[PDB]
Amino acid sequence: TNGTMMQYFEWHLPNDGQHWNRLRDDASNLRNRGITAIWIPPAWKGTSQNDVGYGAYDLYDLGEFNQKGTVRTKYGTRSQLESAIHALKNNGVQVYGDVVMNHKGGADATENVLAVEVNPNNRNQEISGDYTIEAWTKFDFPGRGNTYSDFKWRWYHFDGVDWDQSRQFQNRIYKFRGDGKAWDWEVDSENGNYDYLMYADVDMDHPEVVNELRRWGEWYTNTLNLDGFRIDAVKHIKYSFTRDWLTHVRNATGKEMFAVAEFWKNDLGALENYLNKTNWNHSVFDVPLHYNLYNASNSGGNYDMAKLLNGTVVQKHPMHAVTFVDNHDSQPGESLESFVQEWFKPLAYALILTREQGYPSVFYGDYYGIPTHSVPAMKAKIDPILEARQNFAYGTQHDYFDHHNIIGWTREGNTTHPNSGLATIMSDGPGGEKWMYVGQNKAGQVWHDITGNKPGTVTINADGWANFSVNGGSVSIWVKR
Numbered sequence: 001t002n003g004t005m006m007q008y009f010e011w012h013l014p015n016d017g018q019h020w021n022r023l024r025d026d027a028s029n030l031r032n033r034g035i036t037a038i039w040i041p042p043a044w045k046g047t048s049q050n051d052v053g054y055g056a057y058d059l060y061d062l063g064e065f066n067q068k069g070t071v072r073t074k075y076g077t078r079s080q081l082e083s084a085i086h087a088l089k090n091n092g093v094q095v096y097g098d099v100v101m102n103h104k105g106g107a108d109a110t111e112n113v114l115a116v117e118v119n120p121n122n123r124n125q126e127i128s129g130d131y132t133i134e135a136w137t138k139f140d141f142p143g144r145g146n147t148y149s150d151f152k153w154r155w156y157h158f159d160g161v162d163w164d165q166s167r168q169f170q171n172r173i174y175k176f177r178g179d180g181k182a183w184d185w186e187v188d189s190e191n192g193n194y195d196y197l198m199y200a201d202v203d204m205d206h207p208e209v210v211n212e213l214r215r216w217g218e219w220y221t222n223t224l225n226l227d228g229f230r231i232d233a234v235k236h237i238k239y240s241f242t243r244d245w246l247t248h249v250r251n252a253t254g255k256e257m258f259a260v261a262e263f264w265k266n267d268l269g270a271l272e273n274y275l276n277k278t279n280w281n282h283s284v285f286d287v288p289l290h291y292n293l294y295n296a297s298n299s300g301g302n303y304d305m306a307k308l309l310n311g312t313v314v315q316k317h318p319m320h321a322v323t324f325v326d327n328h329d330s331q332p333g334e335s336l337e338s339f340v341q342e343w344f345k346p347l348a349y350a351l352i353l354t355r356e357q358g359y360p361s362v363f364y365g366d367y368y369g370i371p372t373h374s375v376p377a378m379k380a381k382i383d384p385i386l387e388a389r390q391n392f393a394y395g396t397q398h399d400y401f402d403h404h405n406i407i408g409w410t411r412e413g414n415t416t417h418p419n420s421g422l423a424t425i426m427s428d429g430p431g432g433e434k435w436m437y438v439g440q441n442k443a444g445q446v447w448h449d450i451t452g453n454k455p456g457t458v459t460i461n462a463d464g465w466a467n468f469s470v471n472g473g474s475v476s477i478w479v480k481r
Ligand SMILES: C[C@H]1O[C@H](O[C@H]2[C@H](O)[C@@H](O)[C@@H](O[C@H]3[C@H](O)[C@@H](O)[C@H](O)O[C@@H]3CO)O[C@@H]2CO)[C@H](O)[C@@H](O)[C@@H]1N[C@H]1C=C(CO)[C@@H](O[C@H]2O[C@H](CO)[C@@H](O[C@H]3O[C@H](CO)[C@@H](O[C@H]4O[C@H](CO)[C@@H](O[C@H]5O[C@H](C)[C@@H](N[C@H]6C=C(CO)[C@@H](O)[C@H](O)[C@H]6O)[C@H](O)[C@H]5O)[C@H](O)[C@H]4O)[C@H](O)[C@H]3O)[C@H](O)[C@H]2O)[C@H](O)[C@H]1O
Pocket: 054, 055, 100, 104, 105, 106, 107, 108, 109, 136, 161, 162, 163, 190, 197, 198, 199, 200, 232, 233, 234, 235, 262, 264, 265, 266, 267, 328, 329, 335, 336
């Protein structure tokens, strides 16, 4: 059976503490639609109650301590999360936790630290003399005390900050002075060295930090019975640290732990470097495919559809690609805004859901809508595609990426999964037809469009061929009636 992940949040969810409850209520529903794994938002305490969670204050506070002016996170309390996960586990759905280790925000107090300024466009270049700044580096976790962990963070656990509380200049980055203080390596080389991103940057060279993060990893996994991870911001984290952290947590827990890493760069070469340096021990989001889809959706029919997979992770390394259409960063108004246009969106979902390559991810914002911006729920359009993946998308695949508008592929089905087999056909331009092979054994069967976009039927010929059709700017998915 085909695996399907859902990203179960978007940026603009309400701060009503109800999100874990929503997830609990949806557990049977998701299982029935073919969702086999859920990626939950940051579960820990952020810099405030309405923090999406990437301003990660205390990784041991899952909405259970009174810190940052709130007990619950944005999403709910720890006991509410724990019953949502039980509901999921009871329905055979796996749970992936987000993992934010690059930085810590929302320090309890400042410290006076000797620092040097570096060039924001080249963090290898020092551009000032040394001087003392007031840095937000002191974390004591007053609400939690020493429960679960007695580790306290101080300036020397960090490499630098972008904020001097005493002077309050913008567009500065401060590297701390001290013995063996340097930006970590290997990290992405955009801006010279891209170790520094935001908040207080974690020093992955520091042996107490490495030990603390490994131990937090086991604790998080065990406390919540997680089946895997989505790892945040990996281009800004020393590559060998991520590789060995994951191995550690897998060894310590005895579980396989699937992991997908967010390496945000539209560059297949950079992604292959990352995968080589981490020894192929986890997957990456297919960021190049997201940009291909985004650009195709904006090209008004003029994109060359035969080239839709060129330069992508899924084309080259299918077993290490998590495919997606949109996420909380590409949604309107957000940091990496590059939202796939609504008319193309069912085509993009058919591409990732009905081909044999890659591990696909459905976005909450697409499925349930983004009411704050004007994005309607596309549940009605995505559901039949999820049904095709669940029941029909099996067996040998035949690809027809051979025209600038009209492309398609077929699946022959297999003997496990009866009635399985399909022909997907789509056009970014005018409608039309394509001759495609579904298998000699399907001769004489009558097929219909599961999307309901094309009314009518198609009878498979004596040799296993049929002329499948599609409307303009549309997708049809043909299966046995
Ligand atoms: C979003 C994405 O970013 C990166 O991607 C880059 C990319 O790498 C780069 O290459 C390029 O991409 C291009 C591609 O390469 C191309 O190939 C392609 O073609 O085109 C692309 C061009 O678009 O650009 C990209 C975007 O820049 C990165 O690589 C990705 O990984 C990343 N996505 C993931 C990463 C995330 C981080 O976890 C996450 O980001 C979210 O969430 C962020 C955090 O909320 C948010 O960040 C923004 O907002 C922050 C908060 O405002 C801001 O922080 C700054 O300001 C703070 C003040 O608010 C500073 O805090 C310090 O000072 C305060 C005062 C302190 N508070 C005190 C004070 C008090 C009162 O006295 C009290 O209230 C408190 O209690 C006290 O403590 C505090 O403690 C201090 O620490 C802070 O230091 C500042 O940094 C961030 O800077 C700002 O960025 C993101 O916007 C958002 O997206 C993603 O969701 C995740 O998926």
